[PDB]
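hey can u run this one w/ IMJ bound, need the structure tokens asap thx
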Amino acid sequence: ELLQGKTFVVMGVANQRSIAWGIARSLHNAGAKLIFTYAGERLERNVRELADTLEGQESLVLPCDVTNDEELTACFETIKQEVGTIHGVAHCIAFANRDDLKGEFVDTSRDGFLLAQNISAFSLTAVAREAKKVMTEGGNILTLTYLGGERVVKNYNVMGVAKASLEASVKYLANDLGQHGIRVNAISAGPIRTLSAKGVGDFNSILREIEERAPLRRTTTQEEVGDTAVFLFSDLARGVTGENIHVDSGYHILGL
Amino acid sequence: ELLQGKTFVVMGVANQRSIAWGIARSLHNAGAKLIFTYAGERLERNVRELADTLEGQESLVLPCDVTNDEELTACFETIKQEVGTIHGVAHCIAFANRDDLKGEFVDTSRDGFLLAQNISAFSLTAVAREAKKVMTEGGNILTLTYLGGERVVKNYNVMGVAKASLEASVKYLANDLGQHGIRVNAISAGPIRTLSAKGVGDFNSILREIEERAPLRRTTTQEEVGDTAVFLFSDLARGVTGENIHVDSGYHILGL
Amino acid sequence: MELLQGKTFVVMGVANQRSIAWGIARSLHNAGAKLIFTYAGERLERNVRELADTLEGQESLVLPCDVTNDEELTACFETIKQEVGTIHGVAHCIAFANRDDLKGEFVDTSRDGFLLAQNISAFSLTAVAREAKKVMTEGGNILTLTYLGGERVVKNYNVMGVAKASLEASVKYLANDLGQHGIRVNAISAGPIRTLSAKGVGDFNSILREIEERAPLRRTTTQEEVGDTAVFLFSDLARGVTGENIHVDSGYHILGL
Amino acid sequence: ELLQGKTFVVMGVANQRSIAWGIARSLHNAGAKLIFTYAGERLERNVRELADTLEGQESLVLPCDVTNDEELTACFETIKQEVGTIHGVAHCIAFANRDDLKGEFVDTSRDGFLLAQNISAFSLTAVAREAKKVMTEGGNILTLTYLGGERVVKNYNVMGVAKASLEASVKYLANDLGQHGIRVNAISAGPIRTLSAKGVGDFNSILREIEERAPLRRTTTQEEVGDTAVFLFSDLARGVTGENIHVDSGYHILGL
Ligand SMILES: NC(=O)C1=CN([C@@H]2O[C@H](COP(=O)(O)OP(=O)(O)OC[C@H]3O[C@@H](n4cnc5c(N)ncnc54)[C@H](OP(=O)(O)O)[C@@H]3O)[C@@H](O)[C@H]2O)C=CC1
Ligand SMILES: NC(=O)C1=CN([C@@H]2O[C@H](COP(=O)(O)OP(=O)(O)OC[C@H]3O[C@@H](n4cnc5c(N)ncnc54)[C@H](OP(=O)(O)O)[C@@H]3O)[C@@H](O)[C@H]2O)C=CC1
Ligand SMILES: NC(=O)C1=CN([C@@H]2O[C@H](COP(=O)(O)OP(=O)(O)OC[C@H]3O[C@@H](n4cnc5c(N)ncnc54)[C@H](OP(=O)(O)O)[C@@H]3O)[C@@H](O)[C@H]2O)C=CC1
Ligand SMILES: NC(=O)C1=CN([C@@H]2O[C@H](COP(=O)(O)OP(=O)(O)OC[C@H]3O[C@@H](n4cnc5c(N)ncnc54)[C@H](OP(=O)(O)O)[C@@H]3O)[C@@H](O)[C@H]2O)C=CC1
Ligand SMILES: Cc1c(CN(C)C(=O)/C=C/c2cnc3c(c2)CCC(=O)N3)c2ccccc2n1C
Ligand SMILES: Cc1c(CN(C)C(=O)/C=C/c2cnc3c(c2)CCC(=O)N3)c2ccccc2n1C
Ligand SMILES: Cc1c(CN(C)C(=O)/C=C/c2cnc3c(c2)CCC(=O)N3)c2ccccc2n1C
Ligand SMILES: Cc1c(CN(C)C(=O)/C=C/c2cnc3c(c2)CCC(=O)N3)c2ccccc2n1C
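ok here u go:
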């Protein structure tokens, strides 16, 4: 099977609905070994719990608050020490202050802006810099992004700008790391019911809109994202780097 | 194994270097059965011998000149008669008059322009129209495009405009066919030495630019395109339609 | 009137006073340009001839130019050459597809329908640039008009959408060819506007309605807004701009959902 | 004539070769009155001297270090009281630590990253929310971008990611401010020999490349940018917002 005997770091499991958890399962289903990380103590339990559901042999679960330089750096030392070699990292982390995800992007504070950039965009680069030390056989680094990073999506505001910065980081990191045998890609996922969609929008109204209008006439699932993540980490995706695959039932192609 | 139980139509094999022969090989390795179509009688011997290098039952090998509506139609009629159900088509077809592939694009004759449009872009639509009839369980339709459709490539000229037309075509067809359970996607391959590289303005130099400047520091293989085609035909890609995956060693990201 | 003072432009595709080409003709004229008009058919000849006539100064040459017809293309620019010697640019505002293709599924478009739309709506830019090349002696700009449907899927635009992708790639390749001859080539991507080429589209009114309420500028596009950006592209101000597609659509093109 | 009786804030003049100085000339030749900002004494005289060369008479030259919220606010507060109404702002500001404009982008420091983001991207939004306060007749906000925010440019690294973020901000800002009669647009300029090109590796080779491969066969001047800027601030451009106009001799259209 595609990922037999390879080991991957998964970052961003918060709960059962986490896109990261879809990715975890698809990779596990494809025969991967998994390392999870989680942000801060309010979660160790929900991630270990999930990790444990997976058939057989304990997955490492590590703390990694990506705003913290030394725990990020320690996280990957542990990985260097526990396992030696990984074959990729799935970066599934985003955060902005909730107040910034409503009315007028022009009103966002510089602290708001830089917090979003720091956690939603710069973290990929920080992670990629540690990941590099421990991917001596090469492989793929993946991030998740969203269409609001390319075109304007109401209320996505500062996150849109931080997705744009994320997608551009993908390209430049692809240009740095290719020579070291490492391919960097994104998945642009369609809107999905997650911890991170608990907010506003009348989210239901937007899913309904995807259902009526997306080419595939349905909304996307965390398993659809995770199967495209299996492709990207697999050998099938060798010649693919610097790319953004939309797993969104085709919505991204529409105009009016 | 991944495409177990499924049959695909591969159009465009002309010899062992054809990117279509790369896709055929990857699809067979992933358990598919194949039907091959070829441009005209002069190619029949090559295609029958390639097909027969693969283990398993024989493989239909049918003439299909995409310029000839009766031939196109009888071809897929024959396919419905003998197999009943397909799961996908790989369209790997292009042509323009070779004198239009030098000098200035502005000097392209009307006949020249419409011939390139006819064979290089409209054929995807005619193919799709007949494939929709035998795609009884849905599936994927793939074509092959090139960066000249997006950005100016010297001498690519009228093929450049026909690729843009092809890629717009993928969008519109994905929008049509989603609701019939059918996805439509393109692979944008980097340059590869094939028959359609014959006569190009120092292809060797082009190959060197890629090798030294592409994020991955190597040229694209027919096998790399074929493994991405596997993904796109597989159920891994069920959320992915109207997409153009660049398999070009990340070359497409580069500015200057 | 100054800014295009002392320059002459060919405007192709005026069919009545709502034509985008006529918004363009007025702006060019108000910027001091002299104008040559083309038409294709027998009768909307006057229509064009009568619109021309309203323009204040010297009378305008008005010439038949069916872009489907090589001889007529050659004769028209030939006649421009004999009559005025030098022109400074061309506005190409011309599209056609069979009406039955602009509904239903794109996958049912016939071969003839496809090639017809490419011929008139995409190739014709190139045929016109080739003729214009020989009369654009001091350089200048070639324009064309496109639509968002050439970049992303717009319901029912179908075959014209593909023909606009085709048009847009032609702008780039022609820009690459002609720059060394002092000629720039650019597109304006206009918002939906009420013209003859909008007659027969499902729900044109509700299209304009959701432009008004959702586009950043909260209003639909006008012919005059298109013509004023045309003035820029034909003027010296734009001398560093080529192979560009400028969206004059109240900002609509930036929106997802 | 074209900008008769309008006033514009021009930000970023550093010396006579500044793009922002090219824009002030064009705006002035089109009838505008101008207000200038600068950060820090290192160049107060330069901007004063330059502003004084101008043949109308007599421009406010105010301090505005976009890093400083109290100073930004004050600068636009001073403008509120002293001029009244403004019709536009040209934001020609960028900065990143020069140690980050070489080597691999992946080795970029946290605060290197957020510094570039803060000066080169966020400042637009900060400037735009002031300005909003003073553009009571509406008008245009312009920023300068570079192709490296769309595609990978060697060494541009953290600035390319910053420009991507800048360009996304343009889109979101335009969605915010359009309802207030305010347009927001970028100009993507070709390489120009300014202070911000000092130290770029092989800059003369970049220029020679542009001259020989760019469609217009020449390199890009400050006057070309200033004249496109005149268009964007004028009534001619009233239907244009959220646009990025490439003023780069057509270079942006080239593939390989
Ligand atoms: N509709 C959608 O849900 C879409 C989401 N995405 C992207 O998918 C990714 C995953 O989000 P999704 O699964 O939806 O939602 P989740 O909320 O489940 O996942 C987000 C994860 O990011 C983590 N995170 C936040 N801050 C930090 C930090 N300081 N250090 C380390 N980790 C942190 C969260 O941890 P914690 O719980 O501790 O805050 C959580 O585990 C995001 O990048 C998101 O934008 C893309 C397209 C569509
Ligand atoms: N560098 C490269 O090689 C790249 C190629 N591509 C694309 O890959 C695709 C395949 O090209 P490639 O494998 O390289 O070259 P090949 O020439 O081996 O394959 C192209 C196929 O198109 C067929 N074809 C041409 N005209 C017709 C027609 N009238 N009816 C039916 N088939 C026809 C050819 O047949 P015949 O020999 O009889 O003409 C040939 O079998 C093309 O669309 C090409 O543009 C994309 C990116 C890079
Ligand atoms: N919402 C909109 O209306 C938008 C339109 N556009 C584009 O703007 C351009 C102008 O269209 P618009 O003004 O809307 O509609 P009009 O119908 O007013 O203009 C279209 C013109 O194209 C001409 N034409 C068609 N076929 C030929 C041919 N064989 N040879 C010469 N001329 C021909 C028509 O002439 P005739 O009547 O004599 O056949 C007509 O004068 C087109 O390219 C269109 O696609 C772009 C964006 C939005
Ligand atoms: N090749 C090129 O020159 C191109 C440049 N650009 C862009 O054009 C814009 C203008 O750059 P250019 O004219 O070349 O170079 P300049 O160095 O002349 O202008 C850059 C300006 O940004 C100012 N700036 C830096 N930090 C701050 C800050 N803390 N607060 C307020 N102002 C600040 C600089 O001031 P100071 O010197 O005092 O630090 C300087 O005046 C930039 O956005 C740049 O990215 C775009 C495309 C091509
Ligand atoms: C699909 C979608 C999302 C979810 N998404 C794609 C994200 O990237 C969400 C990021 C996010 C980032 N930060 C957050 C939260 C969500 C929630 C609560 C919180 O405190 N901080 C989203 C988020 C905000 C506004 C609109 C949105 N749409 C239309
Ligand atoms: C990579 C590459 C190709 C090959 N390619 C991508 C194609 O799409 C080939 C198209 C093609 C299309 N028509 C053709 C021929 C080739 C050859 C001989 C012929 O008679 N007609 C190419 C083809 C022409 C010009 C430049 C080119 N570059 C840089
Ligand atoms: C804005 C818009 C147009 C107008 N447009 C951009 C066009 O390019 C029109 C092209 C055109 C092309 N060919 C045509 C006609 C119109 C009308 C009558 C005819 O007989 N042939 C349009 C046209 C069809 C479907 C949707 C459409 N939308 C949303
Ligand atoms: C054209 C071009 C530029 C200049 N540019 C477009 C910029 O946006 C420059 C931004 C900048 C940002 N921060 C800077 C400096 C320049 C210079 C000195 C310094 O100390 N900090 C550039 C800058 C670095 C690498 C390549 C570059 N190319 C190819």
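The helical segments of chain C are 20-30, 45-54, 70-84, 111-133, 158-178, 204-214, 223-234. anyway lmk if its weird
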